[PDB]
Each structure stands twice: as structure tokens, then as C-alpha cells.
RNA sequence: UUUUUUUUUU
RNA sequence: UCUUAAGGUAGCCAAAUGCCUCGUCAUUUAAUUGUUGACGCGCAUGAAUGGAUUAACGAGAUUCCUACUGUCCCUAACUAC
RNA sequence: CACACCGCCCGUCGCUAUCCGGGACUGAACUGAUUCGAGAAGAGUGGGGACUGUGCGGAAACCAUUUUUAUCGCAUUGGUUUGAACCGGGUAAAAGUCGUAACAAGGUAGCUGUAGGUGAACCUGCAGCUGGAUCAUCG
RNA sequence: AUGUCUUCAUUAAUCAAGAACGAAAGUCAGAGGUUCGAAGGCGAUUAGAUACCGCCCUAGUUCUGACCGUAAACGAUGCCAUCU
RNA sequence: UACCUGAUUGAUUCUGUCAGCGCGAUAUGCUCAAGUAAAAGAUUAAGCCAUGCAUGCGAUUCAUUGAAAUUGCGUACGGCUCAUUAGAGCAGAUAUCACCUUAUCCGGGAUGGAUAACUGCGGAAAUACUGGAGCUAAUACAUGCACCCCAGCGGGGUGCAAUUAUUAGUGUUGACUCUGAAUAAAGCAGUUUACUGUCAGCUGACUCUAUCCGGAAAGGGUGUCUGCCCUUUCAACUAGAUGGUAGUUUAUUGGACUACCAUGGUUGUUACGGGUAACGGAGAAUAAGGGUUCGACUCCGGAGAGGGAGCCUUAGAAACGGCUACCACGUCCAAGGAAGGCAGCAGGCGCGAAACUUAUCCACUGUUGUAUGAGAUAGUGACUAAAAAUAUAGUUGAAUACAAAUGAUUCUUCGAGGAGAGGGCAAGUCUGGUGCCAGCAGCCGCGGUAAUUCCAGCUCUCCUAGUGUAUCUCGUUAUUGCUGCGGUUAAAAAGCUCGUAGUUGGAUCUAGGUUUACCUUGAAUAAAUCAGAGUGCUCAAUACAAGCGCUUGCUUGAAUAGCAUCAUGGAAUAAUGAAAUUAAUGGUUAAGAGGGACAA
């Protein structure tokens, strides 16, 4: 009959639930990049830790290992295409230097207000929620959506939004009526 | 010292198995009478009926009378004492009442200054005792 | 169970068919005959996945009832027929001819061919014996038994079998210096030149084979099929010419 | 019903074994044929795979074989004489493989004379009957007598066999299983085995 | 030579 | 506190030894002044006037279960003298 | 001992609660195996021959027997649970009675083994140990 | 232990099960019974004193032949080999 | 992320546990804007079941296209559950020269009489009950249409298969009593198309049905080697028990069974017995490394259909949506009789802490294909995995989808809750009551009339549509220690010695200028899961897709790694063997190991 659906976790809780240093640092990160909850940042931390642990497991092997070559090139490729890893920094011995801020900057929510599409990060989030942003002719309503290097330059206002060209909003229609 | 020869695997394994029985946790989990001795029969929750209510002198240096109720489990008919959390909740427990009971937290050990009491009431008359204390509901 | 089985679950189906995990609870079971369950393919799977000729299996059965498909030149209407290795499939209405072949990965690929190609096929000699009346026969690994064959034909040798004439044309030998296919093992879909033969008396013997790229690997006899003499292949091979690319080489080829 | 299962026994070490399942069809047994001497009686039994066996209940004729002469003639089983397994079988006249019985000699004598144009220790004072003459003294061309002359070249017969043929009841051993093949085809005893079993039989009847 | 005790918490 | 030579110790018990008494509790039964097991301020138990046990043994005393039966319900018939 | 000797602390006895053990009662209940007795039903074999096809054949009921053997009875035995007069152990409980056993040379140094005795802690005999209150005492 | 230019040539270390020995007290049987001395009985001391102290003592303490197999049977430290 | 923190004291350092702390499983509290995938009466009661369904579809058509019936085929697959079960079962390798097979592949192999529906007569309360009478059909029933012997003139036999006995060796396998060629009998019952629609031109070609032999393939029965839980308050066990011969039975081997015979067989390298809240595996949770625990459950193997037992049919069953009997428990009776098996789907009662609609369909996925509670759709569903609103949803009608639908994907009308706030541990000595009471508190501890801990009121912290509580697993735990603990005083060296099993054992053989064990590399090794490339399903869990031209098209990806057996190479390390006509004829040394002798 039906099978087991394949699931997987992305968030790993810290071993110490409370410590002023981590609490304050993570609060500061939430402030810098508009996020919803600490799970958001733990997700990025655990993706980063998966990346770093895989890179370390690879570096434990010597340089020209077939697996090392394939995985390291692929991982550097993925980070490059996302726009986190530097394209002049091609090595895992150097990928072992990254932070959550790097991946968090590559969220749509940041780019919206970064490139002048919104005043505040909160305004950017509510605009995306109300469907006033678009990417490569693709209305993405997911703030954590991950913006690649290529798509970095392919975001403008929605082709249907009142602010991107369309019918006036509900308030404007009320006033006109 | 322990044996170290390259052909002593049988001795090492047999000795380890023999000495595991001197461990409280392993013996407690593999004795075989756990189900017969444990009132809940290995479960986490159980249901029962009230018989009477008692006040237990809290241990020294604490001075108070903790208000518990003697209950009879429906699964096996065993008699236990269950604690009624929160203030003025014994009022909501009347003799001959159906109660849901759970562990107190220390896995069959008494908790705090209440002597010999290792269970606690989680529902009375199909109502949550916390709801009864908080006024979210009333006695059926 | 109390008797034979008729079904075959999707997961238990051989992996080489590449059947999507979320694509139903059963897999079309090949019926007994020329080939074996783990070393064949259903015509229904052919028409549904490889050629996209059928959106659904009802459509596959509809196409198959029309008696338009030929296998070995014999019109089949069994969607569960065991179309396996070195099997000729000729859809006359569309005038399309295919021969079953093992991809480097080991999968079966749509190997388009012409009429001259479709007109023949190869068979390995599974045994040679003497049926009643004193007429010697040979049995091939695909079950085909051929009467009155050339006496020099022996075990593990290849014979060209003519579909149109149902006769043995040529007899290629299993000896050092013959292009040999590799059907099973982890070297399924690998073509290489036979070399030395480690002879185990009471167990399957071992063969050494080196491909055109020079890579060498060994295997058991039962996985070794001769497909020619010297270096020439008696049939056309798919794009790849029986060479295993390592993963880095495959990526390099991709970009 | 009757089962041939390996379980239900004790293990090599003497331990009791678990019963793996309820009795299975493919491991059944059937009651013994226990064939006897009398009018031909054979039953068909349907067996595994749709095949079928011939269970003999009573048999009188044996299609017996003479090995040296390479001949095979249908004689009649006369009496049971010796059985290695158990003597109740010989007492009850059970025809079981390897059982030792008595057969007629007339068919083999008829074949011997019809094939060798010579007497088979025939009686020393009794003239051959008309049927015997119809095959002994017959007259045909010399081209036909030549083959008989050639067949005469190798025609000596052993003393023990001659004595059995004199008594008219030959000793034979059943080589078939009447409960399995339904037939009592056996072979005539001759030589070392014949002497051994004759000595056994004589020892028992002395006992 | 004889020489036993000191209510509970803080 | 009176008092003796010493004040019944270890054991055991309503006993073949306890009046009150058909002692009180339990067991056996439908029902028991009976049996057995407990209790013991024991009218008046008790240590070679031997105390407490004890396998085997007994034409010794006692209670019960089973089998069996004219002991009985409830008598009848037959044989010898 | 640290509330610092007006310290700490040990037992019997008495009350309360609770867990466990022994216990006459051939106690009781549930459950599994094994011997024996009976034994349904099928299958094999030997009889039988209603009926109908041509002295021959096929044959149903039924009878006897062999085998597989459910199931039921006693009987033995294993395992789990359990009542019981009474007789005992352990533990817990703010403020019960009797004493002073131990911690100072604890007022008879303490403790181990063994044996006896005494309301109780305990006392005494023999041989050990220092974890002693002596690392020592002059040849 | 020491001495050995004697002999064998790995025969060794530790050891479940198994076995010998094993203080004192204690048990059985037979001899002995001086001293001391559990229990016991007295005189003291004491609030009491079933103790410490004193007096008279029974088992025992001694020997022979059997049992028991335990001690703070302690160096509270298993045995064998090697280095500092 | 290879991690710790509070608590014994007047204070200190330890031992040691308790408590805290992270993940996961199950249950449950409060709360929950909409959507996507998605587990789901296993745990206890393999308990009991009302009611509906879950297995039905070429030859034979005088009923009105095809009903009914007879045949044929299938119902041994599929589905469910985990009770039993500890040389059972399973995993890997491996035999079956000891065996059995329908469906599907390759080779060879226009004969007569009776019976239903149909007509009618009927019985019973009651069945999916049936007897007579009149027909009447067949792929039903029947019937089948060159060597040997005598005589080289002539007569017979020889198909396959098969019983026994015998002959020579046209092929293999490592090896064959294997397969072929023959010889002599005899029964043997099995087989070598009286089939449907037909078409083309006396000549042809189909589709179909039936049917044996040989070989395959697929499936199964058995055999071998290695591994797989706890227990000595189980140490000895076993009597068809171990083996031999002759038989019987089976498809075949076999003490499988029988007769006779012998005394064998297992065991401290753990036999035998007992327990398991025990189906085995693939795997799951946790997780530096080494591991610890679990695994009823979607795949593979096994078993069962209330408990037993016995059978019919068949290629295949000891079948249970087949029968027969017994036991337990029910159902309808007009009391004469007749019945039942949801551990299939959906539902009901019970049991419980614990688990969903008495729904729609073959539209999708397979079964031989109209039929399929297999399978696919929708319902309840904070099991769970991913993605996300409360600031700077809904609604009306359209368009889409679907077997029909709903809900998703486009337009248009209007239009915050859980825990917490003394320490562990992030976060208040604010206000009133009570005076060790009520209460809190996992632990340490607060509350005794001036409470940061309760009861309130006011305030803040963690997480967040989730967050607590209870039981259990793993980590924490070097508190089970192989890596890797400890034993003078904290728990722990036997009173001491001898001693079998077990464990461990001194140095020494080509340095230079035959067996094993062990290591390396390959062979055989179902998927799904774990690790692992690529790809904007909007991301991600996921999934395995997809991506360009232009219409009649090209290219695709759907990878790569993950005990025992066999072989190759290596010859250190550790065991093991050789010797008590010529040649060097053949014994290592004698341990700052051990034993024995001698001395005094």
C-alpha cells in the first residue's frame, strides 16, 4: 500500500535554552534581518552547520579525493549561486569562515528594502505578504525565499499591484465610490 | 585488572552481562516484576474512583497538611493516593468520583514534602483540575 | 504462500526499470518464458515510460490489442510478455525498430535501429544435449532451443539467430579475444574484450575484461555475453559504446 | 493425517523441538499397500503434481527377469519363502521389495527351448508333449537351422539352476515395490546370492 | 568513691 | 512495697493435666458440648518426681476424606440345622 | 560536636499509618503439559449390493476393521494469583514511657569472631585488631 | 637462601568446577581435672546495677579421636614479570 | 559543539547519587488565520460482531441484443494480523547426481443419450433445499479419426512416457545409476486437435480450443555452513534417543515409520530445562569515536483465520469470504429442523491513557480484463515534516479540476496562546491578604503578622500558533568502562594454598654488498531508508522532474557508496609440520624462566 512519506528536520534546538550571550546575539540578528522567530535563525545556523560539518568531513580527506572534489565544488557552487560564498574564495578551508548573517542577507525580505522597494524591513514583509513584490515574473510571497545571484537583479514591483500598475487598492476604491 | 588477551571476548562479554545486573537502572528495567509492582502497569495515565480524602503532614521542617485523595484504579482495582494540585481543589473532589491520574514526575518516587504520594490528579469528573482552579469550567 | 505468485510490488521490482516511487503500489510483473524476472522488461513499461506512447496503461493495452507491435517477428498481445535483452521490437505502422540494450548505468534504453539490424539477433549457448530420437540440440539463456546446430557450438558461445528465417547464421566463440557484453553484477552495461579466465572447478568461474579505455574489471561467466569477434560488435550499441564514465567524467561531459 | 515431518522428533542433542506449523499437505504419508498373493488387484492413487501411482493389493503374476539369459517372461508367484525384515511377512505372504518367493518354471523352460532348440534338464523318462514337440523337434531349412546352431554355442546352465528347474519352482527375489509400481516384477536367483539365500532358507526351515 | 538527662523550627 | 530456702527458668497447654467451661477466635458441616490450629494470670503445666520434638512401628485412644456396602429409609426372598 | 556537651545519640515498651514474611485449613481460583479410559469425524482396507446398463459391469445406505485423531473424564505434575485465626519483620510520623549503650580515656577504650545471660540499650568469658588513649623507655 | 663451567629443555603464570590446611569460641566420645573462669550464687556501689569492683564456683580452659570452617583470618593493600 | 550546572559542610577537597539540561515515542491540558504533504483500534481483548459490500469472467443461445443453465478458468494471487514460535524463523553463501509443477516461451508431438434452463405437477415455516415427468443443446459426458523376433520368399513388434533385468559406450559435469542408442517381456488407466468465427483463390491462409514429451523460465519441498535475547534459585541431559541392515511411505532423502541389531548422541567453547509484556530481517531513535535501546507496522521470509483435528478439488491448500466432526459462544424456528466465523473495507459493543466516514468509483495504479473495500478519490485528524496572518481572513458570482465532486491554482462584488520571572536558568527584594494555614516547589528550598518563590492586583522573560504535563528510550554517564572506571581509609582483594576447564606465554633460521590465523585487491551481494549530483514543484520537506525551439522537433537527467563464502597478492606478526649412489648426512642456545641433582 502507501509508503512512508520522507520527512526531515531543519531546526536543532540549542543545548542550553538560556544564556545571556546567545540570547542577546540572536535578538540582535533578528533585529538586523527581519525574521519571525528564533526557529528562523536556528534553521540558518543548522544549514550553516551542515555545510561546515560536511566541509570539515571533506577536509579530513586529502585534496584530490574524488568525493572531496565533487562535493566541495558543488557546495562552493551552491553558495556562489545563492550569493553567500565569495566567487574569488574557492575552497572549503575558506568556507569554514561563514556566519548566519551571510545567508540571512540573501533573503528576499532583506533585498526588498535594500534595493529601495520598501522603507522598512517590516514594510517589505507586509508588501510581500500583500503580493506587491515580484521576482523574474514570479510573485513570491515567501519572505525566507532564497534569492540567487542571478535573480539578485530580477526583482521589481508586481505587474498587477496598485503600486506596480493595477486597480487602486480597497481604500482608493472606497474613496472613489 | 581486566583480561586483555586477543581471545577473551567471551569472558569480557559474560562478565559485563553478569555485572549489568548490579546496576539499579538495568535491574529496574529488566527485573520482570515491573508490571506487577507498578500500579499503572507501565502506562503513563490511568483512571479510577475516589474513596476518601486525607491530609498528610508535610515532612519537616515544612508544616502543612497536603490534601490528597485515595483512589481505586479501574484497570486493576489497586488502591493509590493521588495529590490534588492547586488551592481549594479538594472541594471539587467528592467521594465516589471518577478521576484521571498521572505520575507526579519522579517516576514512582515521592515528590517534595508529601510523604508516600507519587501520583497526582489530572482530571476530575472528566474535567481538567487546572480548568477547575482557573474558573474556565465548573463542576459537571 | 500456498502457491505461485502473480503480482510484483513496485518497490520489489528490479531497480533497473526506474519506476517512480510515488507511481502506484504494483509493478507490471513479467510472465515466465525466455528471460528472467529481474533481467527483462514488460512491454507495458516499454510503451508507457521509454517511448511515452501511452499516457496510461489502459492506453497501453489499447495499443497492444491492435496487434501492431511485433516481438521477434511474432505479433504479441500480452502487455505482460517478458521483453528482455537482445529483444527486437518493430512497430510496423510507425515503421519503428528497436533492440533491447543495456545502458552504461545498466538500464534499458530505446535503441533505434534499421531493418537490416532488426533482421537478426544474438543468443548465448546455455547448454548442449541430446533429445530423444538422437537429434542433438542446444539451449540458449533466452530459452530458445535450436535443433541440429553446428557441432562446434559449445557452452557460452554466441550464435546469430535470424528472426525472418529462424536459423543460426554465424557462431562466435567464447575465447580470449572477443568483444563480450556484461549483463549482470555491478558491471551491467559494460562492454569489454575478454581476457584471462580463472577456473574454479566447483563454482562459477571468473573472467577478466578490459574496455577500450583500458579500464579492467572481472566478473562471473553467467554475466558474460559475447557480442562479436576481435573488436567488432555484431549489433549497434547505444551512445556510449560500452564505456563506464566515473562521476567526475560524467559531470565534465555535462559541462 | 499420516505425516513424514522431520519435526515432532527430538533434536540431535535430545531436546524437544518446536512445532513450526500445522500439518502440511506436501509432507503427508499414506497407508501401506501390504500386498498379498491372489487375484490381480491394483488401485490408482492420485499423487503430487497430478501424477499417479499403482498400489498393488493382491498380485499373482510376476513379469520375472532372468539376467544371465537376458530374458523376461511372465510367470506366476507361488509362495513366499524368506524375508530379511521380518518373518511375519513371509508367514502372511506379503510381496515386498527384496522378498524371496517361489515362481513357476514352465514359461522360462518354454522360452529356453524355443530359443535354443535344446532340452532344459527335461525329464529323463517322459516323452515331450505335443506342445513341447511343436517347438523342439520342428523342422525348417538349413538357413534357419544355422541361427539355432550359432545360439547353441553358448548354452550351458548351472547345476543349482538346473535343480530348481527340476523341482519346477524357482527361487526369486522381488526387485520392484508393489506398493509403488503396482507390479511384482522380480528376478530369478542365480549363483552366489542364490546359494546364500538357499542356505538361509534351509537353516530357517531346520529351525 | 559517686557525677543520669536537656521538647520542635529559627 | 511486703516477703521466701528458692519464689516456675527454657519450653508446653483448655492437653489423658483447666474447675468456671459447651473458655474466646479460625477450620471442618446445612447444622458440631466433637476434630485440628491459635490465645494463656495455667482452680491445680514444666524440665531424668524428666521438659519439648520425633522417622519407623501398634489386634492402643480420637477426627475427617474417599471406596464400599441391608447400619438405615424398609423391609423381602432363599438355603442348612 | 558546629544551635558547638544545656551537643549528639542507641535500643525495648506504648499509639498511628503502611509494605512484606510464616501460618493449621489434604485452603481456593486460573492456566499448560503428561499417563490412562472413552471416543466424534474423515481417510485406507475387507465385506455389502438398494438402483440401473449390457452371467458380466458400475455402484448408494449399511457392517467390520486399521490409521490420523478432535473432545470429554478421572489422576499426576509445572507455573501465576489469592483468603486466613494467630505469630512476626521493615519503614514513616514537630514536640509519648524507661534508662545511658556509643562519640572525650564518653567516665569499665572501642571493635571482630564465638558462647551464654539480662526489661532495653547491652554485660560477661576466650582468642584477635588499632580503625588507641603508646610510632619511644635506655641492659 | 647461598655455591655450582652438574642435569632436563619451555616442562611456565594465573586459575570456573574441584581439593587440603585453617586462631578462638562451639559440638560429639573418652581421659584429666592445677589455674583461671562464660552461665549461676552471694558481698559491695547505685535512684535501680540482671554491670564495672570483691568472694565461691559450673561448662570450658589441658590431652586423645572426630566435627564446624568462621575472625579487625589486617599490611583493612590478590598473584607472577619488569623499570625508577 | 568530543560541554555540563544545583544539592551532604561552620567552611574545604573528594566519593556518590538525586535534580536540572537536548532529542525521540506514546498519551493528555490550554490554545489554535487560512492552505500543502501526511500517521492513524499494533500496545489491552488473535475479544465479540448487527448491518452493507470485498470473486467473479472463451465453448454451449428455439428467452425477450444477449437473460438462464452446463462447461472452461480463476477464487492457493491479492488483503489483514503478529497469537504461537528461541537449531522454530530469519540473513548471507550454498546443494537438490534426492525432488514436484497450470498459466508463458522454445523445440518435438465429422460418431449416441441425458441433463439443465424452458413447460408442468409438488413438499417444507425456514435456507443460494430440492424429486419426479416431457424435451432439448456441447471445447460437458462417451467413442477415437532404420532396427529386433519367426521364416533370406514372407509374417509381426518398435511413438513418447513408463516397471524390471541386461548390453555398448552420443553428449556433458568437477563427479553421474544423468541424458541418448539398443535388447526381453508386460500392463498402464497418461498423450500424438470429431473445437468456435472464418476469409482469399480443387489450391491456401487465419484466429482459437484441446493435448503429451524434452528443455527452459517462475514457484515450491527439503539439505548444508556461519550469526542472531535473558537465566545456574536450570549441571548434567537424551531411549526412536545415536547409528547399521532389509523393507514401507512420500514427489523425493531421511528413524519419516516398521523388524532385527549395536550403545550410542549433546554438554562449562554452557548441553538440558525455565522466562520473554519475542514473529526474523531490511531497518528506527539517540548519537565525537566505540556503543545503548527498539523493530506490531507500507518491502522480503514465516505463521494464522474463535481453538483443535480430518479431508475434497487441484498443477498448486491440510484452503477456512471450501467442506466434515468435536469444544466455546451466538442466530432463525411453526420446535420437526436450518445455520455462523470481519486478525478484508466501512461501521457497532467491549477493553482501555490510547487510534477516523455503516461515503464515491474502476476515472489512476495491477490482476489473464466487464469485476475488483486489491487500487484510486474525497471525509475526522495540533501523530509528524516542510512553507507561513494579526499590521503599514472571508464573501458573490464567474473562469479550472474531477469517474462525478470538494478543496487547491486565476478574476470580480462587497468587506495570541502556552509556559515562566530566588538559584540551577532568561526575566520584579511594586501593592493588599494569610501568619508554617492555604499553597508553591522536578532538586535546593519559600510561607510562623514587613512573602522578589503562595493567594490575588500591577509589571516584565522564553517560545511562538504553538507551548506545557505524565511514562519510556538515547545522550548527559569514563554512574557498566573493549576504547575506558574503581577495590589501604569513601562500595569493593577470596584466610591461605593445590588444581582441571579458560586466558596468556622468553630468545633463536637469508642478513648483506606444507598448513592455518592476519592484511590488500577483486567476484556473488532486492528494493525503500541513511550518506550522496542536478533541478526555483514560488522555497523547503519533498518529488524526480525538467529545459530549448517553434507547429510535422532536438536533447535529456532519474547518479555515486554502503558478517560468512570464493579468489589474488603479501610472508612481518602468532600458531603449526618435518630426518632421532651421493652428502658437511640429520638434535638451535641453555633464559638475571622453570624443575631436579650435589654441597655444607
Swiss-Prot record, chain A:
<dbReference type="GO" id="GO:0005730">
    <property type="term" value="C:nucleolus"/>
</dbReference>
<keyword id="KW-0699">rRNA-binding</keyword>
<dbReference type="InterPro" id="IPR001912">
    <property type="entry name" value="Ribosomal_uS4_N"/>
</dbReference>
<dbReference type="GO" id="GO:0006412">
    <property type="term" value="P:translation"/>
</dbReference>
<protein>
    <recommendedName>
        <fullName>Small ribosomal subunit protein uS4</fullName>
    </recommendedName>
</protein>
<keyword id="KW-0689">Ribosomal protein</keyword>
<keyword id="KW-0963">Cytoplasm</keyword>
<dbReference type="InterPro" id="IPR005710">
    <property type="entry name" value="Ribosomal_uS4_euk/arc"/>
</dbReference>
<dbReference type="GO" id="GO:0042274">
    <property type="term" value="P:ribosomal small subunit biogenesis"/>
</dbReference>
<dbReference type="Pfam" id="PF00163">
    <property type="entry name" value="Ribosomal_S4"/>
</dbReference>
<keyword id="KW-0539">Nucleus</keyword>
<dbReference type="Pfam" id="PF01479">
    <property type="entry name" value="S4"/>
</dbReference>
From Swiss-Prot, chain B:
<keyword id="KW-0379">Hydroxylation</keyword>
<dbReference type="InterPro" id="IPR006032">
    <property type="entry name" value="Ribosomal_uS12"/>
</dbReference>
<keyword id="KW-0963">Cytoplasm</keyword>
<comment type="subunit">
    <text>Component of the 40S small ribosomal subunit.</text>
</comment>
<comment type="similarity">
    <text>Belongs to the universal ribosomal protein uS12 family.</text>
</comment>
<dbReference type="GO" id="GO:0002181">
    <property type="term" value="P:cytoplasmic translation"/>
</dbReference>
<dbReference type="Pfam" id="PF00164">
    <property type="entry name" value="Ribosom_S12_S23"/>
</dbReference>
<dbReference type="GO" id="GO:0005791">
    <property type="term" value="C:rough endoplasmic reticulum"/>
</dbReference>
<feature type="modified residue" description="Hydroxyproline">
    <location>
        <position position="61"/>
    </location>
</feature>
<dbReference type="GO" id="GO:0022627">
    <property type="term" value="C:cytosolic small ribosomal subunit"/>
</dbReference>
<dbReference type="GO" id="GO:0003735">
    <property type="term" value="F:structural constituent of ribosome"/>
</dbReference>
<protein>
    <recommendedName>
        <fullName>Small ribosomal subunit protein uS12</fullName>
    </recommendedName>
</protein>
Curated annotation (Swiss-Prot), chain C:
<dbReference type="Pfam" id="PF16121">
    <property type="entry name" value="40S_S4_C"/>
</dbReference>
<dbReference type="InterPro" id="IPR041982">
    <property type="entry name" value="Ribosomal_eS4_KOW"/>
</dbReference>
<dbReference type="GO" id="GO:0019843">
    <property type="term" value="F:rRNA binding"/>
</dbReference>
<dbReference type="InterPro" id="IPR038237">
    <property type="entry name" value="Ribosomal_eS4_central_sf"/>
</dbReference>
<dbReference type="GO" id="GO:0003723">
    <property type="term" value="F:RNA binding"/>
</dbReference>
<dbReference type="InterPro" id="IPR014722">
    <property type="entry name" value="Rib_uL2_dom2"/>
</dbReference>
<keyword id="KW-0699">rRNA-binding</keyword>
<dbReference type="InterPro" id="IPR013843">
    <property type="entry name" value="Ribosomal_eS4_N"/>
</dbReference>
<dbReference type="GO" id="GO:0006412">
    <property type="term" value="P:translation"/>
</dbReference>
<comment type="similarity">
    <text>Belongs to the eukaryotic ribosomal protein eS4 family.</text>
</comment>
<feature type="domain" description="S4 RNA-binding">
    <location>
        <begin position="41"/>
        <end position="100"/>
    </location>
</feature>
<dbReference type="InterPro" id="IPR036986">
    <property type="entry name" value="S4_RNA-bd_sf"/>
</dbReference>
Swiss-Prot record, chain D:
<comment type="subunit">
    <text>Component of the small ribosomal subunit. Identified in a IGF2BP1-dependent mRNP granule complex containing untranslated mRNAs. Part of the small subunit (SSU) processome, composed of more than 70 proteins and the RNA chaperone small nucleolar RNA (snoRNA) U3.</text>
</comment>
<keyword id="KW-0449">Lipoprotein</keyword>
<dbReference type="Pfam" id="PF01201">
    <property type="entry name" value="Ribosomal_S8e"/>
</dbReference>
<dbReference type="InterPro" id="IPR001047">
    <property type="entry name" value="Ribosomal_eS8"/>
</dbReference>
<keyword id="KW-0472">Membrane</keyword>
<dbReference type="GO" id="GO:0006412">
    <property type="term" value="P:translation"/>
</dbReference>
<dbReference type="GO" id="GO:0032040">
    <property type="term" value="C:small-subunit processome"/>
</dbReference>
<keyword id="KW-0539">Nucleus</keyword>
<protein>
    <recommendedName>
        <fullName>Small ribosomal subunit protein eS8</fullName>
    </recommendedName>
</protein>
<keyword id="KW-0687">Ribonucleoprotein</keyword>
<dbReference type="GO" id="GO:0003735">
    <property type="term" value="F:structural constituent of ribosome"/>
</dbReference>
<keyword id="KW-0963">Cytoplasm</keyword>
Amino acid at each position: 500500500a502507501r509508503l512512508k512519506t520522507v520527512q526531515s528536520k531543519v531546526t536543532k534546538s540549542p543545548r542550553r535554552p538560556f544564556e545571556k550571550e546567545r540570547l542577546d546575539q540572536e535578538l540582535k540578528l533578528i533585529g538586523t534581518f527581519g525574521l519571525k522567530n528564533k526557529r528562523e535563525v536556528w534553521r540558518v545556523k543548522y544549514t550553516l552547520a551542515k555545510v561546515r560539518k560536511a566541509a570539515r568531513e571533506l577536509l579530513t580527506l586529502e585534496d584530490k579525493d574524488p568525493k572531496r572534489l565533487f562535493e566541495g565544488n558543488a557546495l562552493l557552487r551552491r553558495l556562489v549561486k545563492i550569493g553567500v560564498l565569495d566567487e574569488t574564495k574557492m575552497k572549503l578551508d575558506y568556507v569554514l569562515g561563514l556566519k548566519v548573517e551571510d545567508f540571512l542577507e540573501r533573503r528576499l525580505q532583506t533585498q526588498v528594502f535594500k534595493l529601495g522597494l520598501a522603507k522598512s524591513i517590516h514594510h517589505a514583509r507586509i508588501l510581500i505578504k500583500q503580493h506587491h513584490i515580484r521576482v523574474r515574473r514570479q510573485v513570491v510571497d515567501v519572505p525566507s525565499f532564497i534569492v540567487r545571484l542571478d535573480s539578485q537583479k530580477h526583482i521589481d514591483f508586481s505587474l498587477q499591484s496598485p503600486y506596480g500598475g493595477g486597480r487602486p487598492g480597497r481604500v482608493k476604491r472606497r474613496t472613489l465610490r | 585488572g581486566k583480561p586483555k588477551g586477543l581471545c577473551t571476548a567471551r569472558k569480557l562479554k559474560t562478565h559485563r552481562q553478569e555485572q549489568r545486573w548490579n546496576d539499579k537502572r538495568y535491574k529496574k528495567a529488566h527485573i520482570g516484576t515491573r508490571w506487577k509492582s507498578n500500579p499503572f502497569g507501565g502506562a503513563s495515565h490511568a483512571k479510577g474512583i475516589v474513596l476518601e480524602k486525607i491530609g498528610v503532614e508535610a515532612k519537616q521542617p515544612n508544616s502543612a497538611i497536603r490534601k490528597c485523595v485515595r483512589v481505586q484504579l479501574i484497570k486493576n482495582g489497586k488502591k493509590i493516593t493521588a495529590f490534588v494540585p492547586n488551592d481549594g481543589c479538594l472541594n471539587f473532589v467528592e467521594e465516589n468520583d471518577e478521576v484521571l491520574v498521572s505520575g507526579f514526575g519522579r517516576s514512582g518516587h515521592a515528590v517534595g514534602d508529601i510523604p508516600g504520594v507519587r501520583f497526582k490528579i489530572v482530571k476530575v469528573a472528566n474535567t481538567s483540575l487546572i480548568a477547575l482552579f482557573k474558573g474556565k469550567k465548573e463542576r459537571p | 504462500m500456498r502457491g505461485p505468485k502473480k503480482h510484483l510490488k513496485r518497490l520489489a521490482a528490479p531497480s533497473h526499470w526506474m519506476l517512480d516511487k510515488l507511481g502506484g503500489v504494483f509493478a507490471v510483473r513479467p510472465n515466465p518464458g525466455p528471460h528472467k524476472l529481474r533481467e527483462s522488461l514488460p512491454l507495458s513499461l516499454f510503451l508507457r515510460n521509454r517511448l511515452k506512447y501511452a499516457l496510461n496503461y489502459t492506453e497501453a493495452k489499447k495499443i497492444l490489442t491492435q496487434r501492431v507491435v511485433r516481438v521477434d517477428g511474432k505479433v504479441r498481445t500480452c502487455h505482460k510478455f517478458p521483453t528482455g535483452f537482445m529483444d527486437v521490437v518493430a512497430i510496423e505502422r510507425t515503421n519503428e525498430y528497436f533492440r533491447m540494450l543495456y545502458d552504461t548505468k545498466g538500464r534499458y534504453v530505446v535503441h533505434r535501429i534499421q531493418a537490416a539490424e532488426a533482421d537478426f539477433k544474438l543468443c548465448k549457448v546455455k547448454s548442449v544435449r541430446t533429445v530423444n530420437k538422437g537429434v542433438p540440440v542446444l539451449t540458449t539463456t533466452d530459452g530458445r532451443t535450436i535443433r541440429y546446430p553446428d557441432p562446434h557450438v559449445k557452452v557460452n558461445d554466441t550464435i546469430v539467430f535470424n528472426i525472418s528465417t529462424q536459423k543460426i547464421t554465424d557462431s562466435v566463440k567464447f575465447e580470449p579475444g572477443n568483444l563480450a557484453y556484461v549483463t549482470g553484477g555491478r558491471n551491467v552495461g559494460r562492454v569489454g574484450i575478454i581476457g584471462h579466465r580463472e577456473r574454479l572447478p566447483g563454482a562459477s568461474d571468473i573472467i577478466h575484461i578490459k574496455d577500450s579505455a583500458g579500464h579492467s574489471f572481472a566478473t562471473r561467466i553467467s554475466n558474460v555475453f559475447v557480442i562479436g569477434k576481435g573488436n567488432k560488435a555484431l549489433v549497434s550499441l547505444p551512445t556510449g559504446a560500452g564505456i563506464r564514465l566515473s562521476i567526475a567524467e560524467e559531470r565534465d561531459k555535462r559541462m | 493425517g499420516i505425516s513424514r515431518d522431520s519435526w515432532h522428533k527430538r533434536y540431535k542433542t535430545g531436546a524437544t523441538q518446536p512445532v513450526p506449523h500445522k500439518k502440511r499437505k506436501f509432507e503427508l504419508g499414506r497407508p501401506a499397500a501390504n500386498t498379498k498373493i491372489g487375484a490381480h488387484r491394483v488401485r490408482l492413487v492420485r499423487t503430487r503434481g497430478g501424477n499417479e501411482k499403482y498400489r498393488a493389493l493382491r498380485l499373482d503374476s510376476g513379469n520375472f527377469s532372468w539376467a544371465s539369459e537376458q530374458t523376461t517372461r511372465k510367470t506366476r508367484i507361488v509362495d513366499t519363502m524368506y524375508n530379511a525384515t521380518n518373518n511375519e511377512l513371509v508367514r502372511t505372504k506379503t510381496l515386498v521389495k527384496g522378498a524371496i518367493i517361489s515362481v513357476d518354471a514352465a514359461p522360462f523352460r518354454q522360452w529356453y527351448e524355443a530359443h535354443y532348440a535344446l532340452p532344459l534338464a527335461r525329464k529323463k523318462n517322459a516323452k515331450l508333449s505335443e506342445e513341447d514337440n511343436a517347438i523342439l523337434n520342428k523342422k525348417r531349412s538349413h538357413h534357419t537351422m544355422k541361427k539355432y546352431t550359432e545360439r547353441q554355442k553358448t548354452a550351458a546352465v548351472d547345476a543349482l539352476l538346473i535343480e530348481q528347474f527340476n523341482t519346477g519352482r524357482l527361487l526369486a527375489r522381488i526387485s520392484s515395490s508393489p506398493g509403488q509400481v503396482g507390479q511384482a516384477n522380480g528376478y530369478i536367483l542365480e549363483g552366489k546370492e542364490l546359494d546364500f539365500y538357499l542356505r538361509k532358507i534351509r537353516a530357517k526351515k531346520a529351525k
